[PDB]
């Protein structure tokens, strides 16, 4: 198989439709004999009393669970690659583009039913939309 | 390879970016051992003197040339499938969705840089965007 689809990126957030997108990205990765790289985006207020560190630990912990499940799915299907935890500074769309650049992804897979509209309007890299 | 990507549809109009999308759809079709179905969309005034039949013959003829080239690319790459000429009544986006339903396509491939925004906003079927 060529390199145009050698490395596939799929954005996860724990939602059902994102999980649905993962199953689609996996199936594509297995069919095209490609590497899959699931990413969980941690997208984190400045106020008296408020402590953002509580939610940072939370979504990171949630990311661990989500990415571990993604890894488990990949292992069973025999699909190579390793899930990444990504954190925005940025907006989610750009962070996904930065992740794609640094990982070397030639394709971004997303679950849909705005960030998708962003990535499409950007047109910086091939994007695959999977509806719920 | 599974059936989730057994039949791929790619929308052509003769433009460079659509041709670029065809090369991407072909590469995917070859990697996933999938059938490719390129479609050329004929999207056709009511005025005294004006004769739409002239342009109908034209874009159909242009479609023949475009689809013949697509077939030639598929044949060389050893990719199965057969190009289709489609005509709107409808809008282009819905016509592509109707074509996907009748052909049995599980994926629609498009070249981008509105119809893409439509198909995404519709979310009736998986869509792959390839930027120029």
Short mmCIF file of C-alpha atoms in Angstrom, two decimals:
data_model
loop_
_atom_site.label_atom_id
_atom_site.label_comp_id
_atom_site.label_asym_id
_atom_site.label_seq_id
_atom_site.Cartn_x
_atom_site.Cartn_y
_atom_site.Cartn_z
CA UNK A 1 0.00 0.00 0.00
CA UNK A 2 1.09 3.55 -0.82
CA UNK A 3 2.07 6.27 1.66
CA UNK A 4 -0.85 8.55 0.83
CA UNK A 5 -2.77 6.70 3.52
CA UNK A 6 0.13 5.20 5.47
CA UNK A 7 -0.71 7.03 8.70
CA UNK A 8 -4.30 7.78 9.70
CA UNK A 9 -5.36 10.13 12.49
CA UNK A 10 -8.77 9.83 14.19
CA UNK A 11 -10.05 12.37 16.72
CA UNK A 12 -11.63 10.94 19.87
CA UNK A 13 -13.49 12.65 22.72
CA UNK A 14 -15.37 9.72 24.23
CA UNK A 15 -18.64 10.38 22.42
CA UNK A 16 -20.56 7.59 20.66
CA UNK A 17 -20.10 9.16 17.22
CA UNK A 18 -16.36 9.53 17.80
CA UNK A 19 -16.24 5.88 18.81
CA UNK A 20 -18.17 5.14 15.62
CA UNK A 21 -15.53 7.08 13.71
CA UNK A 22 -12.82 5.01 15.38
CA UNK A 23 -14.42 1.79 14.14
CA UNK A 24 -14.47 3.26 10.64
CA UNK A 25 -10.87 4.47 10.87
CA UNK A 26 -9.84 1.05 12.17
CA UNK A 27 -11.59 -0.75 9.31
CA UNK A 28 -9.86 1.55 6.85
CA UNK A 29 -6.50 1.11 8.59
CA UNK A 30 -6.86 -2.67 8.41
CA UNK A 31 -8.02 -2.69 4.78
CA UNK A 32 -5.31 -0.29 3.64
CA UNK A 33 -2.76 -1.93 5.95
CA UNK A 34 -2.18 1.48 7.49
CA UNK A 35 -0.96 2.81 10.82
CA UNK A 36 -3.68 4.32 13.01
CA UNK A 37 -3.10 7.15 15.48
CA UNK A 38 -6.14 7.95 17.65
CA UNK A 39 -5.85 11.30 19.42
CA UNK A 40 -7.72 12.53 22.49
CA UNK A 41 -7.95 16.32 22.62
CA UNK A 42 -7.76 17.95 26.04
CA UNK A 43 -9.43 21.31 25.53
CA UNK A 44 -9.24 23.34 28.74
CA UNK A 45 -11.51 29.41 33.77
CA UNK A 46 -9.81 32.33 35.49
CA UNK A 47 -11.98 33.05 38.51
CA UNK A 48 -11.61 33.38 42.31
CA UNK A 49 -11.90 29.94 43.91
CA UNK A 50 -11.98 28.08 40.60
CA UNK A 51 -9.26 25.45 40.12
CA UNK A 52 -8.69 24.31 36.50
CA UNK A 53 -6.16 21.68 37.64
CA UNK A 54 -9.03 19.50 38.85
CA UNK A 55 -10.51 19.29 35.35
CA UNK A 56 -7.08 18.97 33.73
CA UNK A 57 -6.37 15.81 35.72
CA UNK A 58 -9.90 14.66 34.91
CA UNK A 59 -9.85 14.92 31.12
CA UNK A 60 -6.30 13.57 31.05
CA UNK A 61 -7.51 10.60 33.09
CA UNK A 62 -10.52 10.28 30.79
CA UNK A 63 -8.13 10.45 27.85
CA UNK A 64 -6.11 7.57 29.29
CA UNK A 65 -9.22 5.38 29.50
CA UNK A 66 -10.39 6.36 26.01
CA UNK A 67 -6.97 5.89 24.40
CA UNK A 68 -6.47 2.58 26.21
CA UNK A 69 -9.72 1.32 24.71
CA UNK A 70 -8.64 2.55 21.28
CA UNK A 71 -5.34 0.70 21.70
CA UNK A 72 -7.24 -2.43 22.74
CA UNK A 73 -9.35 -2.23 19.58
CA UNK A 74 -6.24 -1.74 17.43
CA UNK A 75 -4.43 -4.66 19.06
CA UNK A 76 -7.33 -7.06 18.42
CA UNK A 77 -7.66 -5.93 14.80
CA UNK A 78 -3.89 -6.17 14.40
CA UNK A 79 -3.61 -2.51 13.42
CA UNK A 80 -0.28 -0.80 14.10
CA UNK A 81 0.16 2.66 15.60
CA UNK A 82 -0.05 4.31 19.01
CA UNK A 83 -2.74 6.64 20.44
CA UNK A 84 -1.71 10.15 21.51
CA UNK A 85 -3.00 12.56 24.13
CA UNK A 86 -3.04 16.11 22.78
CA UNK A 87 -3.75 19.37 24.59
CA UNK A 88 -4.72 22.74 23.13
CA UNK A 89 -2.85 25.90 24.14
CA UNK A 90 -5.14 27.39 19.94
CA UNK A 91 -8.45 25.86 18.93
CA UNK A 92 -9.21 22.13 18.62
CA UNK A 93 -9.14 22.21 14.81
CA UNK A 94 -5.66 23.76 14.64
CA UNK A 95 -4.39 21.46 17.38
CA UNK A 96 -5.51 18.50 15.28
CA UNK A 97 -3.69 20.01 12.31
CA UNK A 98 -0.55 20.50 14.39
CA UNK A 99 -0.81 16.92 15.62
CA UNK A 100 -1.20 15.71 12.03
CA UNK A 101 1.90 17.66 10.96
CA UNK A 102 4.09 16.39 13.80
CA UNK A 103 2.86 12.79 13.59
CA UNK A 104 3.07 12.79 9.81
CA UNK A 105 -0.58 11.94 9.28
CA UNK A 106 -1.83 12.07 5.70
CA UNK A 107 -5.48 11.73 6.73
CA UNK A 108 -7.71 12.96 9.55
CA UNK A 109 -10.82 11.00 10.50
CA UNK A 110 -13.67 12.68 12.39
CA UNK A 111 -17.11 11.76 13.67
CA UNK A 112 -19.91 14.15 12.76
CA UNK A 113 -23.69 14.58 13.00
CA UNK A 114 -18.05 23.03 13.65
CA UNK A 115 -14.56 21.63 14.21
CA UNK A 116 -15.29 19.49 11.16
CA UNK A 117 -16.49 22.58 9.29
CA UNK A 118 -13.28 24.28 10.40
CA UNK A 119 -10.92 21.53 9.20
CA UNK A 120 -12.80 21.45 5.90
CA UNK A 121 -12.76 25.23 5.51
CA UNK A 122 -9.05 25.17 6.35
CA UNK A 123 -8.30 22.47 3.78
CA UNK A 124 -4.77 21.94 5.09
CA UNK A 125 -5.05 18.15 4.99
CA UNK A 126 -7.41 15.37 3.76
CA UNK A 127 -10.40 14.91 6.08
CA UNK A 128 -12.82 11.97 6.34
CA UNK A 129 -16.24 12.67 7.85
CA UNK A 130 -18.19 9.80 9.41
CA UNK A 131 -21.81 10.65 10.36
CA UNK A 132 -23.39 9.00 13.42
CA UNK B 1 -11.18 -6.15 2.76
CA UNK B 2 -14.50 -5.28 4.41
CA UNK B 3 -17.58 -3.83 2.72
CA UNK B 4 -17.47 -0.53 4.60
CA UNK B 5 -15.25 0.73 1.79
CA UNK B 6 -16.13 -1.79 -0.92
CA UNK B 7 -17.53 0.82 -3.31
CA UNK B 8 -16.09 4.33 -3.50
CA UNK B 9 -17.69 7.27 -5.30
CA UNK B 10 -15.64 10.26 -6.49
CA UNK B 11 -17.22 13.40 -7.96
CA UNK B 12 -15.60 14.77 -11.12
CA UNK B 13 -16.23 17.99 -13.04
CA UNK B 14 -13.02 18.30 -15.05
CA UNK B 15 -11.29 20.68 -12.66
CA UNK B 16 -7.69 20.13 -11.53
CA UNK B 17 -8.69 19.63 -7.89
CA UNK B 18 -11.33 17.09 -8.87
CA UNK B 19 -8.69 15.28 -10.91
CA UNK B 20 -6.48 15.45 -7.83
CA UNK B 21 -9.32 13.89 -5.84
CA UNK B 22 -9.59 11.12 -8.43
CA UNK B 23 -5.92 10.24 -7.96
CA UNK B 24 -6.52 10.06 -4.22
CA UNK B 25 -9.69 7.98 -4.61
CA UNK B 26 -7.83 5.67 -6.99
CA UNK B 27 -4.94 5.22 -4.56
CA UNK B 28 -7.43 4.41 -1.81
CA UNK B 29 -9.37 2.05 -4.08
CA UNK B 30 -6.17 0.19 -4.96
CA UNK B 31 -4.92 0.03 -1.37
CA UNK B 32 -8.27 -1.10 0.02
CA UNK B 33 -8.88 -3.32 -3.02
CA UNK B 34 -12.12 -1.44 -3.56
CA UNK B 35 -14.39 -0.69 -6.50
CA UNK B 36 -14.24 2.90 -7.73
CA UNK B 37 -17.16 4.73 -9.33
CA UNK B 38 -16.27 8.19 -10.69
CA UNK B 39 -19.32 10.32 -11.44
CA UNK B 40 -19.60 13.35 -13.70
CA UNK B 41 -22.44 15.66 -12.68
CA UNK B 42 -24.33 17.41 -15.47
CA UNK B 43 -25.87 20.43 -13.76
CA UNK B 44 -28.04 22.32 -16.23
CA UNK B 45 -32.15 28.92 -18.88
CA UNK B 46 -35.72 29.70 -19.90
CA UNK B 47 -35.41 32.68 -22.23
CA UNK B 48 -36.46 33.67 -25.78
CA UNK B 49 -33.82 32.48 -28.25
CA UNK B 50 -31.83 30.55 -25.65
CA UNK B 51 -31.36 26.83 -26.37
CA UNK B 52 -30.28 24.69 -23.37
CA UNK B 53 -29.93 21.60 -25.58
CA UNK B 54 -26.66 23.00 -26.94
CA UNK B 55 -25.08 23.02 -23.48
CA UNK B 56 -26.67 19.69 -22.54
CA UNK B 57 -24.93 17.97 -25.45
CA UNK B 58 -21.77 19.86 -24.50
CA UNK B 59 -21.45 18.86 -20.85
CA UNK B 60 -22.53 15.31 -21.70
CA UNK B 61 -19.78 15.23 -24.32
CA UNK B 62 -17.37 16.72 -21.80
CA UNK B 63 -18.51 14.09 -19.32
CA UNK B 64 -17.70 11.35 -21.82
CA UNK B 65 -14.13 12.63 -22.20
CA UNK B 66 -13.68 13.07 -18.44
CA UNK B 67 -15.15 9.67 -17.56
CA UNK B 68 -13.13 7.98 -20.31
CA UNK B 69 -9.95 9.39 -18.78
CA UNK B 70 -11.07 8.22 -15.34
CA UNK B 71 -11.69 4.74 -16.76
CA UNK B 72 -8.24 4.80 -18.38
CA UNK B 73 -6.65 5.64 -15.03
CA UNK B 74 -8.60 2.86 -13.30
CA UNK B 75 -7.65 0.31 -15.97
CA UNK B 76 -3.93 1.06 -15.64
CA UNK B 77 -4.08 0.89 -11.84
CA UNK B 78 -6.12 -2.31 -12.08
CA UNK B 79 -9.00 -0.80 -10.13
CA UNK B 80 -12.46 -2.26 -10.76
CA UNK B 81 -15.65 -0.26 -11.23
CA UNK B 82 -17.32 1.81 -13.94
CA UNK B 83 -17.72 5.62 -14.22
CA UNK B 84 -21.25 7.06 -14.35
CA UNK B 85 -22.73 10.16 -15.94
CA UNK B 86 -25.28 11.76 -13.62
CA UNK B 87 -27.67 14.64 -14.27
CA UNK B 88 -29.49 16.83 -11.77
CA UNK B 89 -33.25 17.41 -12.08
CA UNK B 90 -32.40 18.79 -7.34
CA UNK B 91 -29.05 20.24 -6.34
CA UNK B 92 -25.63 18.68 -7.03
CA UNK B 93 -25.18 17.56 -3.41
CA UNK B 94 -28.47 15.65 -3.31
CA UNK B 95 -27.85 14.18 -6.76
CA UNK B 96 -24.55 12.81 -5.48
CA UNK B 97 -26.40 11.36 -2.49
CA UNK B 98 -28.99 9.78 -4.78
CA UNK B 99 -26.21 8.37 -6.95
CA UNK B 100 -24.51 6.96 -3.85
CA UNK B 101 -27.75 5.30 -2.73
CA UNK B 102 -28.50 3.72 -6.10
CA UNK B 103 -24.91 2.64 -6.78
CA UNK B 104 -24.48 1.36 -3.23
CA UNK B 105 -21.52 3.60 -2.44
CA UNK B 106 -20.34 3.60 1.17
CA UNK B 107 -18.02 6.56 0.62
CA UNK B 108 -18.04 9.81 -1.35
CA UNK B 109 -14.76 11.43 -2.36
CA UNK B 110 -14.63 15.14 -3.24
CA UNK B 111 -12.02 17.70 -4.21
CA UNK B 112 -12.05 20.94 -2.24
CA UNK B 113 -10.13 24.20 -1.79
CA UNK B 114 -20.25 24.64 -0.76
CA UNK B 115 -21.35 21.30 -2.22
CA UNK B 116 -18.79 19.80 0.15
CA UNK B 117 -20.19 21.90 2.99
CA UNK B 118 -23.64 20.65 1.97
CA UNK B 119 -22.74 16.94 1.95
CA UNK B 120 -21.05 17.40 5.33
CA UNK B 121 -23.97 19.34 6.79
CA UNK B 122 -26.30 16.65 5.43
CA UNK B 123 -24.26 13.83 6.96
CA UNK B 124 -26.19 11.16 5.06
CA UNK B 125 -23.04 9.26 4.09
CA UNK B 126 -19.26 9.21 4.78
CA UNK B 127 -17.42 11.98 2.89
CA UNK B 128 -13.70 12.32 2.14
CA UNK B 129 -12.39 15.82 1.42
CA UNK B 130 -9.19 16.22 -0.60
CA UNK B 131 -7.81 19.79 -0.72
CA UNK B 132 -6.00 21.01 -3.86
#
